Design a protein around this ligand. Structure first.
Ligand SMILES: CSc1sc(-c2cc[nH]n2)c2c1C(=O)N[C@@H](c1ccccc1)C2
Ligand SMILES: [Cl-]
Length: 270
């Protein structure tokens, strides 16, 4: 069951973003990310259950005093959207003096990021668990290019990624989810294809040239996102497999993961 942590053992340092999420040190020294909220019990049991190398580690709860706390591992390099944007074509301009080898991520690194998000989605699909909000803003980066699926639904600095209908991430959603709120492992695989597009554009917002209502019309009409400049044709063919109009015609996350792993392996020594 759910592991409990004594409040005395949690020493807050500062805030990370907004429910408030803080950086802290935990005893039994160790860095951690702590979630404090102003449904908790259901989530605690769920997060104790979801255990995988590519799912952010949950350590337990603090159910003594106010607020109630949720303890997670600290992911140094932050959210995957910010990481992509800061390790993109303009990385040299954006980098601080001390930054190590500033520049855009190469093909091998982009494929290793994509494969780790896919591995996490393979685990969730095997458990018949539907994420509903897969996007780079919901993935986290740790030291050594370790990528894990974080939040399950964001940090408010990404409010522009949601449309009010109850906030929906319409740009990552297939037509059946936009029209009927039909969420399945097949709508998550569509969102995965959009994550691939975000990765290969270094964090651009999908349909950035369009407003929310223009994006809804394009998606429901069957328009597909253009191939990114850094995207090889074989990676775009994977995106297209995720974007089949009929949910049952979409490739399974398992085959997508196997294809990305096969492409990563063939590029390792080059
Ligand atoms: C190094 S920066 C960082 S590490 C980190 C985290 C979370 C679990 N481990 N590590 C978070 C953040 C951040 O930029 N935003 C925080 C957030 C706030 C509200 C909602 C969703 C996300 C989460
Ligand atoms: Cl193709």
């Amino acid at each position: 069951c759910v592991h409990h942590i004594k409040r005395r053992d949690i020493v807050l340092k500062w805030e990370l973003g907004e429910g408030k999420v803080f950086l802290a040190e935990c005893h039994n020294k160790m860095l951690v990310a702590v979630k404090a909220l102003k449904d908790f019990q259901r989530e605690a049991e769920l997060l104790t259950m979801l255990q995988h190398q590519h799912i952010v580690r949950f350590f337990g709860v603090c159910t003594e005093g106010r607020p109630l706390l949720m303890v997670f591992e600290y992911m140094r390099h932050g959210d995957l959207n910010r990481f992509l944007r800061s390790h993109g074509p303009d990385a040299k301009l954006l980098a601080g003096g001390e930054d190590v080898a500033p520049g855009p991520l190469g093909l091998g690194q982009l494929l290793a990021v994509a494969s780790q998000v896919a591995a996490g989605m393979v685990y969730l699909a095997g458990l018949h668990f539907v994420h509903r909000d897969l996007a780079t803003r919901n993935c986290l980066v740790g030291q050594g290019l370790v990528v894990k699926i974080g939040d399950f639904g964001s940090r408010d600095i990404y409010s522009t990624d949601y449309y009010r209908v109850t906030m929906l991430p319409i740009r990552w959603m297939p037509p059946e989810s936009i029209l009927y709120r039909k969420f399945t492992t097949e709508s998550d695989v569509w969102s995965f294809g959009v994550v691939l597009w975000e990765i290969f554009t270094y964090g651009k917002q999908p349909w950035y040239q369009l407003s929310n209502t223009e994006a809804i019309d394009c998606i429901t009409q069957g328009r597909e996102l253009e191939r990114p400049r850094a995207c090889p044709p074989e990676v775009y063919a994977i995106m297209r497999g995720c974007w089949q109009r009929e949910p049952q015609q979409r490739h399974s996350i398992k085959d997508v993961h196997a294809r990305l792993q096969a492409l990563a392996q063939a590029h390792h020594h080059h």
